[PDB]
Design a protein around this ligand. Structure first.
Ligand code: CLA
Ligand code: CLA
Ligand code: CLA
Ligand code: CLA
Ligand code: CLA
Ligand code: CLA
Ligand code: CLA
Ligand code: CLA
Ligand code: RRX
Ligand code: BCR
Ligand code: PQN
Ligand code: CA
Lengths: 165, 80, 67, 39, 37, 733, 107, 63
């Protein structure tokens, strides 16, 4: 559709690749008796291969002349043409998890900083406190906005060290 | 010869003088610090540039500073 | 478009606008003795005159392209 | 026991446990949802 | 037209890359080893 | 005692070791550091040095013209430029064996010769050169030009001819002349050559100093030019059936805007290039009348800069004090020139390959490859030099009090932010660009190529569509036949341009896919990382938290000793040294991409690059391993072929590259102790102890070793790739 | 040596993708990587890294995410030890992948 | 008794100091006329491993 690509569902190269892959697995399945554990394993890989080629096509992925799925990363083209589960949604999923890790770690460092030996709490992890922050990190995005709006997220330049210039 | 300089920040710890492996420094009477003594560099011609004095200097920033300069047989620490 | 007419008119127009309109602004921006009352020296003529020639040739050039 | 739990709270131990947990979680997911290319 | 003879390389290549280098190296080494009056 | 060399530094002249010889050669062009140096003498020395550089360049060009006219086959290549291989020069090696003589005998025989990959044959042919007499005369002229610049160099340094510092500081006058004359008049003179000689030669008419006056460039003469009927000059251009160099299909136009390429030569039209130089010549000549020199009109650069201050205080004092900052800093001036020339050099590489200006250049794959790689590597070194001089500027010329509140001082005030952000970008590109290649390699290894991450370069494809390419179906601007941008230019260049941009056999906007996406992010990784290293060096050149007084030690110093945790490679010079590795890595990636994409296009199977470029095993096996067979077979137990010199050079580069590793990994201390043992051995050896050294033998210095190692590393890098590039392209085509 | 040994016998490791020796191909590339990664430590000095860390520490200070345990560049000796380790690991692993893929295929 | 109070927290103003724009504790102020009488102790060590330094009255400010 976009970029002159073609649905994997209608690509002939996509179909030939699936046959090529299953024919390698079948050429090997022969040297073994039907119930032999080797045979069972090659069969389960063949079933997994058939499901992948079918699942990828059903997801409406586009395929290039190579017969391989290409991912659409433009938010505009992805939303208008049904390709948002390829890069857009993954982006907000990762950003949530990555911010989760960052906000929890920042909250931990801030908590241990007011202790007697912060350095000790960095080599020996205060597990109970760490677990508490780990659970409270689900609402980090709203907490990060509320900190950004109170002006408590950043540090005053006057309190940050710098070189002579 | 390398340029060795002492700064008013000197506290008269004498550590640089004890660390020097070529006797380029010594302690002279002074009135700027509590120790009433300040480091001096009267034999810089024998300095090689090891910078051990700077490693021994505990002030922030260093009170003794070495600037590598013209190279001689003594500056290159050559026994030949 | 008569070549002689286009250029001749173009040069005169720029010389006039530079002698009765932008002379003050240019002088202020500027922050060859001329007996001209507004002190329009020859170098000033060369400048505005050049502008006029360029604009004139441009008009004739595009007109020669017939559109 | 308190000292033993403090040793289990040491950076390397917690890292091994946390990374083993995270790796396991990802492996199991790919074991039940194989070949996940798109959402 | 501005064409050197066939022997040119048979002579120019030897001179430039062997003879001239030796002459250059000789004078250069002398100057460096020379000391200021 | 005090030796004579070097005369510019008594310090070095009083050094009793071998270091004096190395440092005397290494610090000869650093005039500012020479003993008794004054600003005026600094400028006069540079002025004379610049005349010396010009003399060398013109002799280099004269030398090139002479060897082609004396040992090459220009008069044979012109007859058949499609099948005749250009000769660079003859080979006279007495170490050669009879087989090697035969393998190197070619291009019309005439003895062993080297084929030329420089592209001068297509260049001189396009500019009207047709005979060895023409080449010979040009060689003489350029040799004469070299001698004049060498004399001018000598004279402008003699008394009564030594320009004053004020003359060197007359910025407004120098820029007016360089824009109007050096750039504008030169381009105008070139338009005259193209119209009076090159175009007639392309149409089969000889036009030389013998008949140029009795020959009319256009049948209507200059009447159209002075009457304003300029369009007349565009009437009747060469047709698609024009056989270059003959009147067959030849027109009469002198200035056109056809666009695209000549059908047979696959290069740009001479009439389009004549009109190009005429238009840019007019622009430059006008631009050269902007600054005030002596006639009461013009701009004062200081007044311009002083006026550019945002009213909201977003840029502090704006550009206040920058006039004097730039005018008094040659390092600042050199930093800008290198940064500009370096960017322009890369543009030359990108435009010359995509829009070939010389006839029969796009068919010479070897020359196309050589020119792009050569200019991209020279560009990389120049960019590195630009930042190096920016760091030197900050340490030697930057005066904080005279730049208080200005944009320059603001930069220093947020250097941590600038560096930390360049660090973040580099990290992101590195983790993701590497992660996607590795994911793809694992998917290829596990036999699942449909599972690899292949992001389409939609944003670039959208730009290509905008330029006319319809392969992507975006349908907009030049790709849309109902667009205004399409209609307005339909009677001008679009037709020729659209034909070329829609032809998938040239290099005009090649088709791009997921492989091109990954390599482009790799290029972005290299550009940001190399900039991070260079920028960090310039911003921290005057000081850091680890060394707050770095400015008192200068641009290049070994270190500050093992104290404070260790301070190896803390100087700004050390930053440049580290950046060169990243620059070579960047130009390596860019040149690999260009060569592989062209090798596949030239072979006629773009699919190979499209399917193998998405994983690094594909690059190693389908580009490096596969294209190295013929080269490594240049010489073997069964004999040798013309590719023997390249096989020998390929290995020669690997040796120099590895020799650099010794100066880069092993450090002085170890070597100094080894030499001391040798000094004992020489003095204790009978007869040998009779001869002695004038310079006490010592290990190379720390800074010297880093330079010698980087040089060996850089030379092997270039020699190895150059040997592989030429051999792979020439042997395969 | 380069042509008839390295280039000719590398065919097995470079063509192992899609088979059981595919791991040797991945390790062959991964080992070339670790070896090149060692050159960063072997050719550089801690003075440059310490300063770069200073600007990174600034960003962590600005967002109040700077660690109590002060980040420091590796010691000079550690820099040398890390470089040699990755050099030997990468180089020996590369020969390992080349040797095993080659021998198992043409054994 | 010139100088900041002992035990008080002050911010360093010496630009070349590792603790510039950082806060330390006033160990003691030398009433004798020494160039730098304020002894300040810091929790974070400098690159040399030192955690104390002397500063002039002007080089320090209550913070
Ligand atoms: C970050 C770099 C980047 C780049 C290079 C592009 C590039 C592009 N985007 Mg875009 N986009 C981006 C980020 C980017 N986008 C982000 C972060 C978002 C989230 C809001 C979007 C949301 C978006 C939408 C909703 C649309 C595009 C569309 C497009 C294509 C045409 C848009 C245009 O005219 O100019 C380039 C655009 C930008 C430089 C920035 C954002 C795009 C603008 C805001 C959309 C305006 C599109 C406009 C209607 C032109 C298309 C007309 C018609 C075909 C719809 C183009 C190839 C259009 C498209 O082709 O859809 C089929 C479309 O409608 N983008
Ligand atoms: C609380 C943990 C934490 C947080 C919130 C941040 C935040 C940030 N870092 Mg960072 N960093 C961290 C840890 C952290 N870092 C560690 C442990 C290291 C040593 C490897 C680094 C090394 C590092 C570098 C070299 C750089 C940053 C940079 C940055 C900034 C740019 C965004 C970025 O993340 O780049 C990417 C950061 C990384 C890839 C480092 C990954 C660190 C892991 C994933 C965090 C885990 C922390 C800890 C184990 C969790 C403890 C939880 C607790 C309950 C026990 C950003 C503000 C960049 C910057 O300065 O931009 C301005 C930059 O160049 N960091
Ligand atoms: C930035 C680099 C990068 C990226 C973006 C990816 C991305 C991806 N890899 Mg991959 N990989 C990489 C590097 C990378 N890889 C490297 C370097 C290696 C070599 C070690 C591998 C080896 C590898 C293998 C062997 C496989 C993948 C697979 C995958 C896909 C599985 C997605 C998934 O797990 O479902 C989604 C998972 C989630 C949504 C869970 C999110 C995490 C938490 C639990 C969610 C919490 C939300 C609140 C995915 C698109 C698998 C695949 O099938 O490919 C298509 C697979 O077989 N990778
Ligand atoms: C920078 C310009 C330049 C360069 C790079 C060369 C390079 C070369 N010239 Mg040459 N030459 C030049 C200018 C140049 N020339 C000019 C202007 C003239 C006119 C006087 C000549 C006249 C000339 C003759 C007559 C011959 C050469 C020859 C040679 C080759 C022998 C190499 C050698 O060292 O022996 C000799 C080098 C020189 C005589 C010129 C020195 C240039 C060096 C490289 C600087 C060599 C490749 C020889 C040859 O053809 O070998 C096959 C030979 O016979 N040259
Ligand atoms: C018409 C007046 C005029 C002209 C023609 C020149 C010309 C020149 N001056 Mg100059 N100058 C002038 C007036 C003039 N000056 C005045 C009035 C002053 C006093 C204020 C000065 C003060 C001055 C100084 C202090 C210096 C010069 C220098 C130079 C030389 C620059 C060297 C160079 O870069 O190569 C030539 C540069 C060009 C040809 C510009 C074009 C570059 C483009 C980017 C290349 C593109 C080419 C094309 C696209 C592709 C080519 C393909 C193929 C042909 C290869 C140059 C030849 C320098 C010098 O002395 O060198 C010896 C220098 O130091 N001048
Ligand atoms: C118009 C261009 C230009 C100009 C006029 C200058 C001018 C200057 N530079 Mg400079 N520079 C430039 C471009 C330029 N540079 C570029 C493009 C780079 C990036 C590579 C650099 C990088 C650079 C650095 C890092 C330094 C300078 C320095 C200097 C100053 C003194 C150094 C010197 O010249 O001593 C003499 C120079 C040499 C003796 C050259 C050294 C030998 C090298 C390794 C070349 C050897 C190659 C070898 C022949 C290969 C053999 C192969 C063969 C066997 C086949 C001087 C004022 C130095 C400085 O700032 O002063 C303190 C310094 O530190 N430059
Ligand atoms: C193949 C060799 C190699 C590699 C891979 C790198 C990589 C890198 N260099 Mg580098 N460099 C090299 C050679 C190399 N260099 C050489 C020879 C020199 C000359 C001495 C330099 C000089 C140099 C300088 C001066 C600088 C860099 C910088 C960087 C970083 C730039 C930011 C980035 O891209 O983040 C991307 C991150 C990666 C590519 C690493 C991938 C993540 C790993 C592999 C995943 C973890 C694997 C697994 C989970 C755990 C493995 C360990 C195991 C024992 C548990 C980057 C990581 C800059 C920097 O420091 O960044 C701020 C910089 O300042 N380099
Ligand atoms: C390919 C790279 C390379 C090369 C060629 C060498 C070569 C050498 N290393 Mg070395 N080394 C290297 C990399 C390299 N190393 C690296 C990366 C490291 C870091 C670990 C080291 C660390 C190291 C140490 C610690 C030591 C050496 C030592 C030596 C020397 C051993 C004695 C010897 O064999 O003398 C003979 C010379 C050769 C075998 C070189 C062959 C050159 C050819 C055959 C000669 C051709 C000459 C030619 C015709 C001249 C005319 C040219 C023309 C232009 C005029 C030797 C010259 C040892 C030493 O100092 O010597 C005792 C020593 O202790 N190396
Ligand atoms: C809260 C949080 C943290 C974050 C802290 C801070 C201050 C982060 C700073 C963010 C800043 C200053 C961002 C500045 C500019 C960002 C810009 C201009 C955004 C660019 C994004 C663009 C253009 C979008 C691109 C696309 C979208 C729509 C999504 C995908 O489809 C992919 C793509 C590229 C097409 C801490 C502490 C690191 C801890 C953790 C949690
Ligand atoms: C005095 C007076 C008067 C007036 C008079 C007059 C009449 C004046 C005028 C004068 C003039 C009459 C002026 C003019 C000028 C012009 C010029 C100065 C021009 C120039 C040109 C140019 C510069 C051109 C260039 C170019 C070429 C060459 C080529 C193409 C392109 C172009 C066109 C661009 C009056 C009565 C009012 C009053 C009283 C007195
Ligand atoms: C890159 C490099 C560095 C920088 C290298 C560093 C800082 C090593 C980085 C080690 C880790 C990544 C730092 C943090 C380790 C944490 C324990 C990781 C925790 C993160 C969780 C996910 C576990 C030097 O310090 C150096 C010194 C001397 C010569 C060369 C070099 C050199 O090349
Ligand atoms: Ca002719």
């Amino acid at each position: 559709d976009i970029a002159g690509l073609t649905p994997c569902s209608e690509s002939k190269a996509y179909a030939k690749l699936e046959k090529k892959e299953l024919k390698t697995l079948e050429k090997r399945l022969k040297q073994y008796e039907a119930d032999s554990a080797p045979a069972v394993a090659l069969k389960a890989t063949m079933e997994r291969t058939k499901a992948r080629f079918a699942n990828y096509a059903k997801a409406g992925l586009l395929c290039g002349n190579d017969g391989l799925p290409h991912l659409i990363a433009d938010p505009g083209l992805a939303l208008k043409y049904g390709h948002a589960g390829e890069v857009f949604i993954p982006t907000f999923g990762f950003l949530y998890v990555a911010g989760y890790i960052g906000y929890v770690g920042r909250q931990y460092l801030i908590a241990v900083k007011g202790e007697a030996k912060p350095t000790d709490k960095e080599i020996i992890i205060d597990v109970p406190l760490a677990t508490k922050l780990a659970w409270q990190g689900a609402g980090w995005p709203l907490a990060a906005v509320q900190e950004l709006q109170r002006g408590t997220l950043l540090e005053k330049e006057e309190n940050i060290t710098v070189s002579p210039r | 010869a390398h340029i060795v300089k002492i700064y008013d920040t000197c506290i008269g710890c004498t550590q640089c003088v004890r660390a020097c492996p070529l006797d380029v420094l010594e302690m002279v009477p002074w009135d700027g610090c509590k120790a009433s003594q300040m480091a001096s560099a009267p034999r810089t011609e024998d300095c090689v540039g090891c910078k051990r004095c700077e490693t021994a200097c505990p002030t922030d920033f260093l009170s003794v500073r070495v600037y590598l300069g013209s190279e001689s047989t003594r500056s290159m620490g050559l026994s030949y | 478009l008569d070549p002689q007419i286009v250029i001749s008119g173009s040069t005169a127009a720029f010389l006039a606008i530079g002698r009765f309109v932008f002379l003050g602004y240019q002088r202020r921006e500027a922050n060859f003795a001329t007996n001209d009352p507004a002190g329009f020296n020859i170098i000033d003529v060369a400048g505005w005159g050049a502008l006029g020639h360029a604009v004139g040739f441009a008009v004739l050039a595009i007109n020669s392209l017939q559109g | 026991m308190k000292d033993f739990t403090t040793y289990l709270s040491t950076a390397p131990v917690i890292a091994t446990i946390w990374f083993t947990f995270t790796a396991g979680l990802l492996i199991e997911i790919n074991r039940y949802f194989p070949d996940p290319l798109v959402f | 037209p501005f064409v050197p003879p066939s022997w040119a390389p048979s002579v120019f290549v030897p001179l430039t890359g062997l003879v001239l280098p030796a002459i250059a190296m000789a004078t250069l080494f002398v100057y460096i080893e020379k000391e200021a009056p | 005692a005090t030796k004579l060399f070097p005369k510019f530094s008594q310090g070095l002249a009083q050094d009793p070791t071998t270091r004096r010889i190395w440092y005397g050669l290494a610090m000869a062009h650093d005039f500012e550091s020479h003993d008794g140096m004054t600003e005026e003498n600094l400028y006069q020395k540079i002025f004379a040095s610049h005349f010396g550089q010009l003399s060398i360049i013109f002799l280099w060009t004269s030398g090139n013209l002479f060897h082609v006219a004396w040992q090459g086959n220009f008069e044979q290549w012109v007859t058949d430029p499609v099948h005749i291989r250009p000769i660079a020069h003859a080979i006279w090696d007495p170490h050669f064996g009879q087989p090697a003589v035969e393998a190197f005998t070619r291009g019309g025989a005439s003895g062993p010769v080297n084929i030329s990959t420089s592209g001068v044959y297509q260049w001189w042919y396009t500019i009207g050169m047709r005979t060895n007499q023409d080449l010979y005369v040009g060689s003489v002229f350029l040799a004469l030009v070299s001698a004049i610049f060498l004399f001018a160099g000598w004279l402008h340094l003699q008394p009564n001819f030594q320009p004053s510092l004020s003359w060197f500081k007359d910025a407004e006058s120098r820029l007016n002349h360089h824009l109007s004359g050096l750039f504008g008049v030169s381009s105008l003179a070139w338009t005259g050559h193209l119209v009076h000689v090159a175009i007639p030669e392309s149409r089969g008419q000889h036009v030389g100093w013998d008949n140029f006056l009795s020959v009319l460039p256009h049948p209507q003469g200059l009447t159209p030019f002075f009457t304003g009927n300029w369009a007349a000059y565009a009437q009747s251009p060469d047709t698609a059936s024009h056989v270059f160099g003959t009147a067959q299909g030849s027109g009469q136009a002198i200035l056109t805007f056809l666009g695209g390429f000549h059908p047979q030569t696959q290069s740009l039209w001479l009439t389009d290039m004549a009109h190009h130089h005429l238009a840019i010549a007019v622009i430059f000549i006008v631009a050269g009348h902007m600054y005030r020199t002596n006639f009461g009109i013009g701009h004062r650069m200081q007044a311009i800069l002083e006026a550019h201050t945002p009213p909201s205080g977003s840029l502090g004092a704006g550009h206040k004090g920058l006039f004097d900052t730039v005018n008094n800093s040659l390092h600042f001036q050199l930093g800008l020139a290198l940064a500009s020339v370096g960017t322009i050099t890369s543009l030359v590489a990108q435009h010359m390959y995509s829009l070939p200006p010389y006839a029969f250049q796009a068919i010479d794959f070897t020359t196309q490859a050589a020119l792009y790689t050569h200019h991209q590597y020279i560009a990389g070194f120049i960019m590195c030099g630009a930042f190096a001089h920016g760091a030197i500027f900050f340490i030697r010329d930057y005066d904080p009090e005279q730049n208080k509140g200005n944009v320059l001082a603001r930069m220093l005030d947020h250097k941590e932010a600038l560096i930390s952000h360049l660090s973040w970008v580099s990290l992101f590109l590195g983790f993701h660009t590497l992660g996607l290649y590795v994911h793809n390699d694992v998917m290829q290894a596990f036999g699942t190529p449909e599972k690899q991450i292949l992001i389409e370069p939609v944003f670039a494809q959208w730009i290509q569509a905008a330029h006319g390419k319809a392969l992507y179906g975006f349908d907009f601007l030049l790709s849309s036949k109902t667009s205004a941008a399409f209609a307005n230019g339909q009677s001008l260049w679009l037709p020729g341009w659209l034909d070329a941009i829609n032809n998938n056999q040239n290099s005009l906007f090649l088709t791009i896919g997921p492989g091109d996406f990954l390599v482009h992010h790799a290029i972005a990784l290299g550009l940001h990382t190399t900039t991070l290293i260079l920028v960090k060096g310039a911003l921290d050149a005057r000081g850091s938290k680890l060394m707050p007084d770095k400015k008192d030690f200068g641009y290049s110093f070994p270190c500050d000793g093992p104290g404070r945790g260790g301070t190896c490679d803390i100087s700004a010079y050390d930053a440049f040294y580290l950046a060169v590795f990243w620059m070579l890595n960047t130009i390596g990636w860019v040149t690999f991409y260009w060569h592989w994409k062209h090798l596949t296009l030239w072979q006629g199977n773009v699919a190979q690059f499209d399917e193998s470029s998405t994983y690094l095993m594909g690059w190693l096996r389908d580009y490096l391993w596969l294209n190295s067979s013929q080269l490594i077979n240049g010489y073997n137990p069964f004999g040798m072929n013309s590719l023997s010199v390249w096989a020998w050079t390929f290995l020669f580069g690997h040796l120099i590259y590895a020799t650099g590793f010794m100066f880069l990994i092993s450090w002085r201390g170890y070597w100094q102790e080894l030499i001391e043992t040798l000094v004992w051995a020489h003095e204790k050896t009978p007869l040998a102890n009779l001869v002695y050294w004038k310079d006490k033998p010592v290990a190379l210095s720390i800074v010297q070793a880093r330079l010698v190692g980087l040089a060996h590393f850089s030379v092997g890098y270039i020699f190895t790739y150059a040997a592989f590039l030429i051999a792979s392209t020439s042997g395969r085509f | 040596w380069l042509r008839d040994f390295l280039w000719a016998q590398s065919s097995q490791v470079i063509q192992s993708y899609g088979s059981a020796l595919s791991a040797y191909g991945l390790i062959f590339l991964g080992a070339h990587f670790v070896w090149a990664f060692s050159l960063m430590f072997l050719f550089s000095g801690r003075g440059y890294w310490q300063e770069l860390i200073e600007s990174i520490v600034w960003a962590h200070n600005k967002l109040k995410v700077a660690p109590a345990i002060q980040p420091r560049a590796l010691s000079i000796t550690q820099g040398r030890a890390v470089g040699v380790a990755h050099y030997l690991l990468g180089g020996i692993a590369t020969t390992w992948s080349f040797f095993l893929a080659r021998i198992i295929s043409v054994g | 008794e010139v100088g900041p109070k002992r035990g008080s927290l002050v911010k360093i103003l010496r630009p070349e100091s590792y603790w510039f724009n950082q806060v330390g504790k006033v160990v003691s102020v030398d009433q004798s006329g020494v160039r730098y009488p304020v002894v300040v102790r810091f929790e974070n060590q400098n690159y040399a491993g030192v955690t104390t330094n002397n500063y002039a009255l002007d080089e320090v400010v209550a913070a």
